[PDB]
mmCIF file of N, CA, C and O in Angstrom:
data_model
loop_
_atom_site.group_PDB
_atom_site.id
_atom_site.type_symbol
_atom_site.label_atom_id
_atom_site.label_comp_id
_atom_site.label_asym_id
_atom_site.label_seq_id
_atom_site.Cartn_x
_atom_site.Cartn_y
_atom_site.Cartn_z
ATOM 1 N N UNK P 2055 0.776 -1.195 -0.026
ATOM 2 C CA UNK P 2055 0.023 0.017 0.080
ATOM 3 C C UNK P 2055 0.896 1.260 0.020
ATOM 4 O O UNK P 2055 0.607 2.155 -0.712
ATOM 5 N N UNK P 2056 1.958 1.276 0.851
ATOM 6 C CA UNK P 2056 2.745 2.411 0.962
ATOM 7 C C UNK P 2056 3.469 2.715 -0.430
ATOM 8 O O UNK P 2056 3.515 3.856 -0.904
ATOM 9 N N UNK P 2057 3.908 1.498 -1.090
ATOM 10 C CA UNK P 2057 4.499 1.790 -2.401
ATOM 11 C C UNK P 2057 3.554 2.442 -3.401
ATOM 12 O O UNK P 2057 3.986 3.351 -4.132
ATOM 13 N N UNK P 2058 2.292 1.907 -3.359
ATOM 14 C CA UNK P 2058 1.398 2.446 -4.345
ATOM 15 C C UNK P 2058 1.152 4.001 -4.145
ATOM 16 O O UNK P 2058 1.250 4.712 -5.149
ATOM 17 N N UNK P 2059 1.007 4.372 -2.883
ATOM 18 C CA UNK P 2059 0.807 5.833 -2.540
ATOM 19 C C UNK P 2059 2.023 6.678 -3.021
ATOM 20 O O UNK P 2059 1.917 7.798 -3.495
ATOM 21 N N UNK P 2060 3.195 6.165 -2.763
ATOM 22 C CA UNK P 2060 4.423 6.937 -3.072
ATOM 23 C C UNK P 2060 4.468 7.067 -4.602
ATOM 24 O O UNK P 2060 4.868 8.159 -5.092
ATOM 25 N N UNK P 2061 4.164 6.080 -5.460
ATOM 26 C CA UNK P 2061 4.292 6.249 -6.827
ATOM 27 C C UNK P 2061 3.197 7.193 -7.297
ATOM 28 O O UNK P 2061 3.594 8.008 -8.220
ATOM 29 N N UNK P 2062 2.044 7.240 -6.863
ATOM 30 C CA UNK P 2062 1.052 8.258 -7.184
ATOM 31 C C UNK P 2062 1.558 9.601 -6.910
ATOM 32 O O UNK P 2062 1.354 10.480 -7.766
ATOM 33 N N UNK P 2063 2.167 9.846 -5.716
ATOM 34 C CA UNK P 2063 2.637 11.175 -5.431
ATOM 35 C C UNK P 2063 3.794 11.578 -6.450
ATOM 36 O O UNK P 2063 3.748 12.734 -6.801
ATOM 37 N N UNK P 2064 4.606 10.665 -6.745
ATOM 38 C CA UNK P 2064 5.829 10.988 -7.735
ATOM 39 C C UNK P 2064 5.237 11.315 -9.069
ATOM 40 O O UNK P 2064 5.687 12.356 -9.695
ATOM 41 N N UNK P 2065 4.189 10.576 -9.582
ATOM 42 C CA UNK P 2065 3.596 10.973 -10.735
ATOM 43 C C UNK P 2065 2.959 12.442 -10.695
ATOM 44 O O UNK P 2065 3.094 13.164 -11.710
ATOM 45 N N UNK P 2066 2.313 12.748 -9.661
ATOM 46 C CA UNK P 2066 1.615 14.092 -9.491
ATOM 47 C C UNK P 2066 2.754 15.213 -9.609
ATOM 48 O O UNK P 2066 2.636 16.177 -10.247
ATOM 49 N N UNK P 2067 3.818 15.002 -8.904
ATOM 50 C CA UNK P 2067 4.976 15.929 -8.910
ATOM 51 C C UNK P 2067 5.509 16.172 -10.361
ATOM 52 O O UNK P 2067 5.728 17.289 -10.723
ATOM 53 N N UNK P 2068 5.678 15.024 -11.066
ATOM 54 C CA UNK P 2068 6.102 15.202 -12.493
ATOM 55 C C UNK P 2068 5.290 15.926 -13.329
ATOM 56 O O UNK P 2068 5.617 16.841 -14.077
ATOM 57 N N UNK P 2069 3.909 15.700 -13.155
ATOM 58 C CA UNK P 2069 2.824 16.503 -13.802
ATOM 59 C C UNK P 2069 2.970 18.029 -13.614
ATOM 60 O O UNK P 2069 2.987 18.817 -14.542
ATOM 61 N N UNK P 2070 3.152 18.292 -12.336
ATOM 62 C CA UNK P 2070 3.300 19.724 -11.919
ATOM 63 C C UNK P 2070 4.496 20.397 -12.546
ATOM 64 O O UNK P 2070 4.447 21.499 -13.067
ATOM 65 N N UNK P 2071 5.702 19.717 -12.590
ATOM 66 C CA UNK P 2071 6.787 20.363 -13.253
ATOM 67 C C UNK P 2071 6.656 20.625 -14.706
ATOM 68 O O UNK P 2071 7.015 21.637 -15.294
ATOM 69 N N UNK P 2072 6.050 19.531 -15.351
ATOM 70 C CA UNK P 2072 5.764 19.754 -16.802
ATOM 71 C C UNK P 2072 4.901 20.912 -16.999
ATOM 72 O O UNK P 2072 5.120 21.712 -17.969
ATOM 73 N N UNK P 2073 3.869 21.129 -16.243
ATOM 74 C CA UNK P 2073 2.888 22.172 -16.421
ATOM 75 C C UNK P 2073 3.648 23.497 -16.199
ATOM 76 O O UNK P 2073 3.292 24.499 -16.994
ATOM 77 N N UNK P 2074 4.584 23.622 -15.405
ATOM 78 C CA UNK P 2074 5.259 24.896 -15.142
ATOM 79 C C UNK P 2074 6.112 25.307 -16.378
ATOM 80 O O UNK P 2074 6.104 26.331 -16.783
ATOM 81 N N UNK P 2075 6.693 24.215 -16.965
ATOM 82 C CA UNK P 2075 7.565 24.579 -18.221
ATOM 83 C C UNK P 2075 6.666 25.017 -19.331
ATOM 84 O O UNK P 2075 6.901 26.021 -19.950
ATOM 85 N N UNK P 2076 5.432 24.348 -19.497
ATOM 86 C CA UNK P 2076 4.542 24.771 -20.508
ATOM 87 C C UNK P 2076 3.933 26.124 -20.331
ATOM 88 O O UNK P 2076 3.805 27.009 -21.220
ATOM 89 N N UNK P 2077 3.802 26.528 -18.974
ATOM 90 C CA UNK P 2077 3.285 27.864 -18.642
ATOM 91 C C UNK P 2077 4.372 28.920 -19.065
ATOM 92 O O UNK P 2077 3.977 29.909 -19.607
ATOM 93 N N UNK P 2078 5.689 28.644 -18.899
ATOM 94 C CA UNK P 2078 6.713 29.539 -19.345
ATOM 95 C C UNK P 2078 6.618 29.835 -20.837
ATOM 96 O O UNK P 2078 6.576 30.943 -21.393
ATOM 97 N N UNK P 2079 6.467 28.772 -21.610
ATOM 98 C CA UNK P 2079 6.343 28.933 -23.078
ATOM 99 C C UNK P 2079 5.124 29.719 -23.484
ATOM 100 O O UNK P 2079 5.156 30.471 -24.402
ATOM 101 N N UNK P 2080 3.995 29.535 -22.787
ATOM 102 C CA UNK P 2080 2.902 30.220 -23.001
ATOM 103 C C UNK P 2080 2.971 31.785 -22.780
ATOM 104 O O UNK P 2080 2.524 32.570 -23.474
ATOM 105 N N UNK P 2081 3.749 32.024 -21.758
ATOM 106 C CA UNK P 2081 4.145 33.493 -21.403
ATOM 107 C C UNK P 2081 4.761 34.123 -22.632
ATOM 108 O O UNK P 2081 4.416 35.175 -23.104
ATOM 109 N N UNK P 2082 5.793 33.415 -23.156
ATOM 110 C CA UNK P 2082 6.538 33.970 -24.286
ATOM 111 C C UNK P 2082 5.585 34.158 -25.617
ATOM 112 O O UNK P 2082 5.646 35.166 -26.239
ATOM 113 N N UNK P 2083 4.790 33.209 -25.805
ATOM 114 C CA UNK P 2083 3.836 33.253 -26.939
ATOM 115 C C UNK P 2083 2.930 34.443 -26.801
ATOM 116 O O UNK P 2083 2.696 35.195 -27.707
ATOM 117 N N UNK P 2084 2.416 34.696 -25.557
ATOM 118 C CA UNK P 2084 1.515 35.809 -25.316
ATOM 119 C C UNK P 2084 2.246 37.126 -25.564
ATOM 120 O O UNK P 2084 1.671 38.197 -26.187
ATOM 121 N N UNK P 2085 3.414 37.340 -25.122
ATOM 122 C CA UNK P 2085 4.155 38.483 -25.328
ATOM 123 C C UNK P 2085 4.361 38.846 -26.920
ATOM 124 O O UNK P 2085 4.152 39.900 -27.379
ATOM 125 N N UNK P 2086 4.539 37.671 -27.623
ATOM 126 C CA UNK P 2086 4.602 37.837 -29.094
ATOM 127 C C UNK P 2086 3.414 38.392 -29.712
ATOM 128 O O UNK P 2086 3.454 39.248 -30.678
ATOM 129 N N UNK P 2087 2.345 37.825 -29.208
ATOM 130 C CA UNK P 2087 1.053 38.334 -29.700
ATOM 131 C C UNK P 2087 0.838 39.824 -29.476
ATOM 132 O O UNK P 2087 0.450 40.505 -30.359
ATOM 133 N N UNK P 2088 1.213 40.276 -28.310
ATOM 134 C CA UNK P 2088 1.132 41.720 -28.000
ATOM 135 C C UNK P 2088 2.000 42.555 -28.933
ATOM 136 O O UNK P 2088 1.668 43.632 -29.456
ATOM 137 N N UNK P 2089 3.217 42.076 -29.267
ATOM 138 C CA UNK P 2089 4.011 42.681 -30.217
ATOM 139 C C UNK P 2089 3.334 42.812 -31.695
ATOM 140 O O UNK P 2089 3.463 43.894 -32.221
ATOM 141 N N UNK P 2090 2.650 41.778 -32.010
ATOM 142 C CA UNK P 2090 1.933 41.761 -33.335
ATOM 143 C C UNK P 2090 0.880 42.852 -33.341
ATOM 144 O O UNK P 2090 0.753 43.624 -34.288
ATOM 145 N N UNK P 2091 0.143 42.982 -32.136
ATOM 146 C CA UNK P 2091 -0.864 44.125 -32.189
ATOM 147 C C UNK P 2091 -0.221 45.409 -32.198
ATOM 148 O O UNK P 2091 -0.705 46.344 -32.984
ATOM 149 N N UNK P 2092 1.035 45.693 -31.624
ATOM 150 C CA UNK P 2092 1.650 46.895 -31.752
ATOM 151 C C UNK P 2092 1.966 47.213 -33.236
ATOM 152 O O UNK P 2092 1.932 48.389 -33.759
ATOM 153 N N UNK P 2093 2.614 46.221 -33.973
ATOM 154 C CA UNK P 2093 2.843 46.379 -35.381
ATOM 155 C C UNK P 2093 1.700 46.709 -36.161
ATOM 156 O O UNK P 2093 1.657 47.668 -37.038
ATOM 157 N N UNK P 2094 0.492 46.066 -35.773
ATOM 158 C CA UNK P 2094 -0.725 46.528 -36.488
ATOM 159 C C UNK P 2094 -1.032 48.063 -36.309
ATOM 160 O O UNK P 2094 -1.538 48.785 -37.297
ATOM 161 N N UNK P 2095 -0.886 48.506 -35.033
ATOM 162 C CA UNK P 2095 -1.107 49.935 -34.724
ATOM 163 C C UNK P 2095 -0.218 50.745 -35.619
ATOM 164 O O UNK P 2095 -0.626 51.904 -36.170
ATOM 165 N N UNK P 2096 1.118 50.440 -35.728
ATOM 166 C CA UNK P 2096 1.864 51.217 -36.640
ATOM 167 C C UNK P 2096 1.510 51.213 -38.143
ATOM 168 O O UNK P 2096 1.608 52.219 -38.679
ATOM 169 N N UNK P 2097 1.016 50.196 -38.595
ATOM 170 C CA UNK P 2097 0.393 50.063 -39.950
ATOM 171 C C UNK P 2097 -0.710 51.122 -40.025
ATOM 172 O O UNK P 2097 -0.744 51.923 -41.076
ATOM 173 N N UNK P 2098 -1.606 51.182 -39.104
ATOM 174 C CA UNK P 2098 -2.637 52.121 -39.043
ATOM 175 C C UNK P 2098 -2.194 53.449 -39.060
ATOM 176 O O UNK P 2098 -2.781 54.362 -39.724
ATOM 177 N N UNK P 2099 -1.117 53.847 -38.253
ATOM 178 C CA UNK P 2099 -0.614 55.225 -38.210
ATOM 179 C C UNK P 2099 -0.121 55.618 -39.577
ATOM 180 O O UNK P 2099 -0.368 56.702 -40.054
ATOM 181 N N UNK P 2100 0.546 54.759 -40.378
ATOM 182 C CA UNK P 2100 1.030 55.066 -41.737
ATOM 183 C C UNK P 2100 -0.174 55.281 -42.578
ATOM 184 O O UNK P 2100 -0.086 56.284 -43.398
ATOM 185 N N UNK P 2101 -1.133 54.534 -42.542
ATOM 186 C CA UNK P 2101 -2.365 54.884 -43.338
ATOM 187 C C UNK P 2101 -2.944 56.173 -43.090
ATOM 188 O O UNK P 2101 -3.337 56.801 -43.985
ATOM 189 N N UNK P 2102 -2.974 56.502 -41.773
ATOM 190 C CA UNK P 2102 -3.637 57.837 -41.383
ATOM 191 C C UNK P 2102 -2.693 58.948 -41.993
ATOM 192 O O UNK P 2102 -3.231 59.987 -42.406
ATOM 193 N N UNK P 2103 -1.412 58.767 -41.961
ATOM 194 C CA UNK P 2103 -0.551 59.877 -42.557
ATOM 195 C C UNK P 2103 -0.826 60.000 -44.018
ATOM 196 O O UNK P 2103 -0.925 61.215 -44.475
ATOM 197 N N UNK N 2202 -0.497 68.079 -64.363
ATOM 198 C CA UNK N 2202 0.664 67.845 -63.536
ATOM 199 C C UNK N 2202 0.415 67.776 -62.075
ATOM 200 O O UNK N 2202 0.900 66.812 -61.311
ATOM 201 N N UNK N 2203 -0.429 68.526 -61.471
ATOM 202 C CA UNK N 2203 -0.813 68.586 -60.135
ATOM 203 C C UNK N 2203 -1.484 67.084 -59.811
ATOM 204 O O UNK N 2203 -1.249 66.560 -58.817
ATOM 205 N N UNK N 2204 -2.418 66.733 -60.708
ATOM 206 C CA UNK N 2204 -3.076 65.579 -60.466
ATOM 207 C C UNK N 2204 -2.007 64.353 -60.438
ATOM 208 O O UNK N 2204 -2.123 63.364 -59.598
ATOM 209 N N UNK N 2205 -1.134 64.407 -61.374
ATOM 210 C CA UNK N 2205 -0.025 63.344 -61.307
ATOM 211 C C UNK N 2205 0.733 63.319 -59.953
ATOM 212 O O UNK N 2205 1.059 62.289 -59.401
ATOM 213 N N UNK N 2206 1.007 64.467 -59.514
ATOM 214 C CA UNK N 2206 1.801 64.508 -58.272
ATOM 215 C C UNK N 2206 0.938 63.874 -57.020
ATOM 216 O O UNK N 2206 1.521 63.203 -56.237
ATOM 217 N N UNK N 2207 -0.413 64.162 -57.051
ATOM 218 C CA UNK N 2207 -1.276 63.498 -56.014
ATOM 219 C C UNK N 2207 -1.178 62.021 -56.081
ATOM 220 O O UNK N 2207 -1.124 61.331 -55.169
ATOM 221 N N UNK N 2208 -1.253 61.479 -57.450
ATOM 222 C CA UNK N 2208 -1.222 60.156 -57.674
ATOM 223 C C UNK N 2208 0.109 59.452 -57.158
ATOM 224 O O UNK N 2208 0.135 58.540 -56.448
ATOM 225 N N UNK N 2209 1.237 60.148 -57.430
ATOM 226 C CA UNK N 2209 2.452 59.813 -56.840
ATOM 227 C C UNK N 2209 2.602 59.622 -55.389
ATOM 228 O O UNK N 2209 3.046 58.685 -54.776
ATOM 229 N N UNK N 2210 1.989 60.680 -54.659
ATOM 230 C CA UNK N 2210 1.941 60.558 -53.235
ATOM 231 C C UNK N 2210 1.016 59.326 -52.704
ATOM 232 O O UNK N 2210 1.532 58.668 -51.782
ATOM 233 N N UNK N 2211 0.001 59.099 -53.408
ATOM 234 C CA UNK N 2211 -0.859 57.973 -53.062
ATOM 235 C C UNK N 2211 -0.059 56.580 -53.178
ATOM 236 O O UNK N 2211 -0.087 55.820 -52.184
ATOM 237 N N UNK N 2212 0.665 56.572 -54.251
ATOM 238 C CA UNK N 2212 1.465 55.226 -54.444
ATOM 239 C C UNK N 2212 2.489 55.106 -53.396
ATOM 240 O O UNK N 2212 2.740 54.007 -52.883
ATOM 241 N N UNK N 2213 3.258 56.083 -53.039
ATOM 242 C CA UNK N 2213 4.227 56.135 -52.019
ATOM 243 C C UNK N 2213 3.695 55.699 -50.636
ATOM 244 O O UNK N 2213 4.271 54.908 -49.964
ATOM 245 N N UNK N 2214 2.539 56.284 -50.290
ATOM 246 C CA UNK N 2214 1.903 55.855 -49.068
ATOM 247 C C UNK N 2214 1.572 54.380 -49.120
ATOM 248 O O UNK N 2214 1.682 53.616 -48.036
ATOM 249 N N UNK N 2215 1.121 53.912 -50.250
ATOM 250 C CA UNK N 2215 0.605 52.549 -50.281
ATOM 251 C C UNK N 2215 1.874 51.574 -50.093
ATOM 252 O O UNK N 2215 1.898 50.648 -49.348
ATOM 253 N N UNK N 2216 3.090 52.036 -50.725
ATOM 254 C CA UNK N 2216 4.292 51.144 -50.522
ATOM 255 C C UNK N 2216 4.721 51.220 -49.060
ATOM 256 O O UNK N 2216 5.060 50.019 -48.580
ATOM 257 N N UNK N 2217 4.670 52.289 -48.377
ATOM 258 C CA UNK N 2217 5.082 52.402 -46.996
ATOM 259 C C UNK N 2217 4.177 51.359 -46.142
ATOM 260 O O UNK N 2217 4.613 50.668 -45.252
ATOM 261 N N UNK N 2218 2.775 51.643 -46.353
ATOM 262 C CA UNK N 2218 1.976 50.727 -45.671
ATOM 263 C C UNK N 2218 2.134 49.219 -45.834
ATOM 264 O O UNK N 2218 2.178 48.473 -44.853
ATOM 265 N N UNK N 2219 2.497 48.885 -47.057
ATOM 266 C CA UNK N 2219 2.811 47.437 -47.309
ATOM 267 C C UNK N 2219 4.015 46.978 -46.640
ATOM 268 O O UNK N 2219 4.112 45.820 -46.149
ATOM 269 N N UNK N 2220 5.032 47.853 -46.552
ATOM 270 C CA UNK N 2220 6.214 47.596 -45.868
ATOM 271 C C UNK N 2220 6.049 47.284 -44.458
ATOM 272 O O UNK N 2220 6.654 46.387 -43.844
ATOM 273 N N UNK N 2221 5.162 48.091 -43.816
ATOM 274 C CA UNK N 2221 4.920 47.855 -42.349
ATOM 275 C C UNK N 2221 4.094 46.509 -42.095
ATOM 276 O O UNK N 2221 4.356 45.721 -41.217
ATOM 277 N N UNK N 2222 3.105 46.193 -42.979
ATOM 278 C CA UNK N 2222 2.431 44.917 -43.011
ATOM 279 C C UNK N 2222 3.430 43.842 -43.098
ATOM 280 O O UNK N 2222 3.145 42.716 -42.419
ATOM 281 N N UNK N 2223 4.409 43.895 -43.767
ATOM 282 C CA UNK N 2223 5.395 42.804 -43.835
ATOM 283 C C UNK N 2223 6.065 42.546 -42.456
ATOM 284 O O UNK N 2223 6.270 41.331 -42.100
ATOM 285 N N UNK N 2224 6.324 43.524 -41.704
ATOM 286 C CA UNK N 2224 6.874 43.281 -40.403
ATOM 287 C C UNK N 2224 5.838 42.672 -39.450
ATOM 288 O O UNK N 2224 6.155 41.771 -38.700
ATOM 289 N N UNK N 2225 4.480 43.035 -39.535
ATOM 290 C CA UNK N 2225 3.554 42.412 -38.819
ATOM 291 C C UNK N 2225 3.406 40.898 -39.122
ATOM 292 O O UNK N 2225 3.320 40.062 -38.279
ATOM 293 N N UNK N 2226 3.478 40.679 -40.487
ATOM 294 C CA UNK N 2226 3.396 39.125 -40.869
ATOM 295 C C UNK N 2226 4.551 38.308 -40.355
ATOM 296 O O UNK N 2226 4.325 37.231 -39.948
ATOM 297 N N UNK N 2227 5.797 38.901 -40.345
ATOM 298 C CA UNK N 2227 6.858 38.033 -39.911
ATOM 299 C C UNK N 2227 6.788 37.775 -38.376
ATOM 300 O O UNK N 2227 7.225 36.790 -37.864
ATOM 301 N N UNK N 2228 6.322 38.852 -37.662
ATOM 302 C CA UNK N 2228 6.068 38.465 -36.189
ATOM 303 C C UNK N 2228 5.088 37.449 -36.051
ATOM 304 O O UNK N 2228 5.352 36.570 -35.178
ATOM 305 N N UNK N 2229 3.961 37.512 -36.741
ATOM 306 C CA UNK N 2229 3.050 36.370 -36.667
ATOM 307 C C UNK N 2229 3.702 34.972 -37.018
ATOM 308 O O UNK N 2229 3.491 34.046 -36.389
ATOM 309 N N UNK N 2230 4.589 34.950 -37.995
ATOM 310 C CA UNK N 2230 5.262 33.686 -38.313
ATOM 311 C C UNK N 2230 6.132 33.308 -37.268
ATOM 312 O O UNK N 2230 6.197 32.014 -36.906
ATOM 313 N N UNK N 2231 6.824 34.170 -36.649
ATOM 314 C CA UNK N 2231 7.611 33.800 -35.472
ATOM 315 C C UNK N 2231 6.840 33.210 -34.289
ATOM 316 O O UNK N 2231 7.129 32.155 -33.673
ATOM 317 N N UNK N 2232 5.538 33.757 -34.105
ATOM 318 C CA UNK N 2232 4.690 33.225 -33.056
ATOM 319 C C UNK N 2232 4.137 31.802 -33.491
ATOM 320 O O UNK N 2232 4.274 30.936 -32.609
ATOM 321 N N UNK N 2233 3.902 31.581 -34.804
ATOM 322 C CA UNK N 2233 3.470 30.163 -35.095
ATOM 323 C C UNK N 2233 4.698 29.253 -34.857
ATOM 324 O O UNK N 2233 4.411 28.178 -34.484
ATOM 325 N N UNK N 2234 5.870 29.645 -35.236
ATOM 326 C CA UNK N 2234 7.048 28.727 -35.017
ATOM 327 C C UNK N 2234 7.173 28.269 -33.495
ATOM 328 O O UNK N 2234 7.351 27.146 -33.112
ATOM 329 N N UNK N 2235 7.031 29.268 -32.642
ATOM 330 C CA UNK N 2235 7.061 28.921 -31.153
ATOM 331 C C UNK N 2235 5.904 28.199 -30.862
ATOM 332 O O UNK N 2235 6.167 27.245 -29.958
ATOM 333 N N UNK N 2236 4.840 28.190 -31.432
ATOM 334 C CA UNK N 2236 3.740 27.236 -31.122
ATOM 335 C C UNK N 2236 4.049 25.863 -31.486
ATOM 336 O O UNK N 2236 3.754 24.958 -30.767
ATOM 337 N N UNK N 2237 4.675 25.647 -32.690
ATOM 338 C CA UNK N 2237 5.170 24.427 -33.058
ATOM 339 C C UNK N 2237 6.107 23.799 -32.069
ATOM 340 O O UNK N 2237 6.036 22.599 -31.565
ATOM 341 N N UNK N 2238 7.024 24.614 -31.577
ATOM 342 C CA UNK N 2238 8.078 24.150 -30.621
ATOM 343 C C UNK N 2238 7.398 23.745 -29.273
ATOM 344 O O UNK N 2238 7.705 22.738 -28.595
ATOM 345 N N UNK N 2239 6.223 24.455 -28.951
ATOM 346 C CA UNK N 2239 5.423 24.225 -27.740
ATOM 347 C C UNK N 2239 4.766 22.825 -27.910
ATOM 348 O O UNK N 2239 4.823 22.012 -26.882
ATOM 349 N N UNK N 2240 4.232 22.582 -29.035
ATOM 350 C CA UNK N 2240 3.593 21.250 -29.299
ATOM 351 C C UNK N 2240 4.704 20.050 -29.130
ATOM 352 O O UNK N 2240 4.360 18.959 -28.581
ATOM 353 N N UNK N 2241 5.928 20.316 -29.685
ATOM 354 C CA UNK N 2241 6.842 19.299 -29.588
ATOM 355 C C UNK N 2241 7.325 19.055 -28.175
ATOM 356 O O UNK N 2241 7.530 17.826 -27.729
ATOM 357 N N UNK N 2242 7.375 20.092 -27.327
ATOM 358 C CA UNK N 2242 7.730 19.923 -25.909
ATOM 359 C C UNK N 2242 6.465 19.118 -25.229
ATOM 360 O O UNK N 2242 6.914 18.306 -24.403
ATOM 361 N N UNK N 2243 5.315 19.413 -25.625
ATOM 362 C CA UNK N 2243 4.261 18.530 -24.978
ATOM 363 C C UNK N 2243 4.302 17.108 -25.388
ATOM 364 O O UNK N 2243 4.171 16.185 -24.494
ATOM 365 N N UNK N 2244 4.699 16.766 -26.552
ATOM 366 C CA UNK N 2244 4.945 15.379 -26.892
ATOM 367 C C UNK N 2244 6.053 14.715 -26.170
ATOM 368 O O UNK N 2244 6.000 13.537 -25.696
ATOM 369 N N UNK N 2245 7.112 15.505 -25.942
ATOM 370 C CA UNK N 2245 8.347 14.973 -25.200
ATOM 371 C C UNK N 2245 7.847 14.651 -23.738
ATOM 372 O O UNK N 2245 8.369 13.756 -23.090
ATOM 373 N N UNK N 2246 7.027 15.593 -23.189
ATOM 374 C CA UNK N 2246 6.621 15.494 -21.910
ATOM 375 C C UNK N 2246 5.762 14.133 -21.725
ATOM 376 O O UNK N 2246 5.815 13.395 -20.678
ATOM 377 N N UNK N 2247 4.918 13.831 -22.699
ATOM 378 C CA UNK N 2247 4.159 12.715 -22.640
ATOM 379 C C UNK N 2247 5.001 11.425 -22.727
ATOM 380 O O UNK N 2247 4.784 10.463 -22.009
ATOM 381 N N UNK N 2248 5.972 11.454 -23.579
ATOM 382 C CA UNK N 2248 6.935 10.424 -23.697
ATOM 383 C C UNK N 2248 7.603 10.119 -22.329
ATOM 384 O O UNK N 2248 7.843 8.999 -21.914
ATOM 385 N N UNK N 2249 8.029 11.241 -21.668
ATOM 386 C CA UNK N 2249 8.715 11.008 -20.336
ATOM 387 C C UNK N 2249 7.717 10.476 -19.318
ATOM 388 O O UNK N 2249 8.153 9.735 -18.487
ATOM 389 N N UNK N 2250 6.475 10.870 -19.359
ATOM 390 C CA UNK N 2250 5.489 10.344 -18.429
ATOM 391 C C UNK N 2250 5.386 8.831 -18.674
ATOM 392 O O UNK N 2250 5.451 8.064 -17.571
#
């Protein structure tokens, strides 16, 4: 019984670490999206000129 | 001649706007590439699990 519980805990910890790494990559992706929106604003400024 | 000058100004503005749209597009391409890398990382995580 103790072995079973320990293995379950280890799996949960591994899941958490992988989720953390994926979260970091998502942060970078979202920053890139914001930069794209800024570029669109620049295009609009040129058209207005 | 004045009409021709106005047309020239319009064409120049169009070229500048298209040049800015190019930057927007390449930013979007970089974002898509990072998304592909994210998916590959997810596959590697599943393999490790």
